[PDB]
Amino acid sequence: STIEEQAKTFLDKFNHEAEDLFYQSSLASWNYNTNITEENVQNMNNAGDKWSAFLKEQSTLAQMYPLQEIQNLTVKLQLQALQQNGSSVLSEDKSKRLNTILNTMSTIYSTGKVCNPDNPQECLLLEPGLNEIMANSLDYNERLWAWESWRSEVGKQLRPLYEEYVVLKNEMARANHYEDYGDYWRGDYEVNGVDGYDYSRGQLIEDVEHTFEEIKPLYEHLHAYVRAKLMNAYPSYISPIGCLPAHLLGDMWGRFWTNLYSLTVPFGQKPNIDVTDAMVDQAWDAQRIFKEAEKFFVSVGLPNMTQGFWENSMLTDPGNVQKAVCHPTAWDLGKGDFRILMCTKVTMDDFLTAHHEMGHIQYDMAYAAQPFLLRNGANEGFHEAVGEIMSLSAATPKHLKSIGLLSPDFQEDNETEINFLLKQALTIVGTLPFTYMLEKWRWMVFKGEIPKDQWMKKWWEMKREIVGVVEPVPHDETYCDPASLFHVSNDYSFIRYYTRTLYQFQFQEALCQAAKHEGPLHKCDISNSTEAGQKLFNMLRLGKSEPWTLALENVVGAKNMNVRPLLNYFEPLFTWLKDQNKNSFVGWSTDWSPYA
Amino acid sequence: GNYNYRYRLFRKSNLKPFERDISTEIYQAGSTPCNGVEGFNCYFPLQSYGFQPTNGVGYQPYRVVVLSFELLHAPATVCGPKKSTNLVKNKCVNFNFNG
Ligand SMILES: *[C@@H]1O[C@H](CO)[C@@H](O)[C@H](O)[C@H]1NC(C)=O
Ligand SMILES: *[C@@H]1O[C@H](CO)[C@@H](O)[C@H](O)[C@H]1NC(C)=O
Ligand SMILES: *[C@@H]1O[C@H](CO)[C@@H](O)[C@H](O)[C@H]1NC(C)=O
Ligand SMILES: *[C@@H]1O[C@H](CO)[C@@H](O)[C@H](O)[C@H]1NC(C)=O
Ligand SMILES: *[C@@H]1O[C@H](CO)[C@@H](O)[C@H](O)[C@H]1NC(C)=O
Ligand SMILES: *[C@@H]1O[C@H](CO)[C@@H](O)[C@H](O)[C@H]1NC(C)=O
What we know:
Chain A: Belongs to the peptidase M2 family. Chain A: Its cofactor is Zn(2+); chloride. Chain A: Its EC number is 3.4.17.23, 3.4.17.-. Chain A: It comes from Homo sapiens. Chain B: This is Spike protein S1. The structure is cut from a larger assembly and holds chains A and B. Chain A is built from 23 helices and six strands. By secondary structure, chain A is mainly α. In chain A, strand 4 (329-334) and strand 5 (337-341) form a beta hairpin. In chain A, helix 1 runs antiparallel to helix 2, helix 12 packs across helix 13 and helix 19 (496-514) packs antiparallel against helix 20 (530-540). The longest helix of chain A is centred in the first third of the chain and has 36 residues, at 140-175. Chain A starts with a helix and ends in a 16-residue tail after the last helix. Chain B is mostly loops. Chain B is built from no helices and four strands. Chain B has strands spanning 6-8, 27-28, 42-43, 46-48. The termini of chain B are far apart. The chains are: A mainly alpha, B little secondary structure. Chains A and B meet through helix 1 and helix 11 of A and loops of B. One 2-acetamido-2-deoxy-beta-D-glucopyranose is lined by residues 35, 37, 322 of chain A.
């Protein structure tokens, strides 16, 4: 009869016929990931093509129902999600060109091998070898050689491809009634139709700048301290008034600063909180790691893992004969099937990763009651944030003592808290200006503010202004330095890490306030608190049914992303950095004073 | 995948108690006539169940048997098993033989 009833029946038919197909596609992808064989690749490709064609046909059927005659929020949300053209609005030749460009960028990034000129008999790939060199070397010219050679080869291959990519994506986005591709990415946080809780695409950039203005003093103090320590490590390269050299940040691109913890440790003489040896001595299997994680999740009141999870997951490396992807991934295959694919080692990092992926599994399980097309996070930030809060809680010394992995006579003084907070700042705080600068540069490229001949001159200018990192040698327009990273080269949003980082500490403050913790925020553990788990599960059960602003009101009591929990988390470290920076000069100069 | 189990997904009105609907006529959700072909706004009401052994417990197949007991004015003939106490002789006992 009415349009709304027609849409409701169509959505029921869609969820029914898209659930089995999604389960088949996900199962084919799982069989490829746990068993890399050519028939599994063919089955994955066939299932993906069927899934994409079915989604195209269902979107084509979905567009015939106008949006403004539907008043139910969930039905309107599913119809809005389904009616997106994607690449379908673009012409078939340009769509095929875009797909070919994405596939060839994937092959170039995955199979990119670079080694030193005059010694070409064997070369090293980035993931097996260059990562270890970037993370562990102390030699200036070796890191400079690796960085410049990899950006030379990758940028010179990818620059025309990226020039075509930006034009095709902008054409597709303007064909979809968006200003640019950046507006398309910012449309994930767009809330329309809810009184008071509406969020605009234009408000996101303003909120990011408003939060970053408060991020800036803490990052300036941290950058000054890291600059002083790298000046101690490398005597003549680093200037007191200038930016840091690009190849010395501990990673290939500057994504994380966590590989500089050894060089920038405040108190090396004091011990660490490493619990690896205790698990080796007590012979802790990966199964025991996942059982302890399950014990943590039942302690807070969340549901425990299904029988199918324990039966069907691969929690150990299979062997030489069978090949599997080493990256830890939680899979929501559909129809209540939840699995974790991780090559778990006996390390602290794998234990925290196990907690993070089981948090992903808990988030996936929570919205199982929801309709199929609403089975996602409210935004891209929440999905990662609910795993990062488990990563925060599991890493605390109180959690390690509670589960028996740490000695009960370990002395928790201020120095260990300072160095642990500094390590967490290098991992978490250090990625924020890089993420903000990269996303703002990509938004300005898509918007047309920066012409193609001036992409890099502005970019380094942004990096000096925001990240405080100077180029070793000037780069011309033949280079494509951003596209050497995995996410940007393979069409992935990058603001999810910034939103995840702020939501992580907002959720941490909310759960610690729920758990009635009376000390520092970084000393807080969310185990044994039923009310904290209930407050988490209230947001977790909603999925994508409700706006992210309303979910944030449900958890933290605020209608917008906030920067104060991050500053509260690192406040002892902030005071310590302010004390340590009396002699040194806070802030940097954008000039070429160290080296260019 | 076991697709040998179909359910009715759409009907204009709810079923009466103890009713079986095995009709395979196209459901009309819109004003337009279906004309017997499954196109737009017209769906086939019977849909198959996807049953895999790796599914969760909320999606695994469950066999359901419902027993309906009714009393009508006719003499009741489906009786339960009548437990019999061992026979004791030569003593003054309370006997109940076939009612
Ligand atoms: C992985 O694939 C190989 C070759 O197809 C097969 O022999 C093996 O049984 C598979 N492993 C699993 C766990 O299915
Ligand atoms: C919206 O639709 C869902 C299912 O499609 C239903 O459960 C809910 O009650 C509806 N809301 C309103 C206000 O009608
Ligand atoms: C999808 O594309 C078609 C054809 O260009 C257009 O009519 C429709 O409005 C588009 N949908 C959206 C949501 O922009
Ligand atoms: C999860 O908890 C329930 C109730 O405590 C229990 O019956 C079930 O066996 C548990 N599942 C697993 C896999 O341990
Ligand atoms: C830790 O506390 C002691 C005594 O209060 C003090 O001397 C020391 O400087 C403190 N260290 C840090 C890093 O705050
Ligand atoms: C939380 O519960 C676990 C399981 O009973 C227990 O071992 C642990 O000691 C509890 N934590 C605290 C702080 O009491």
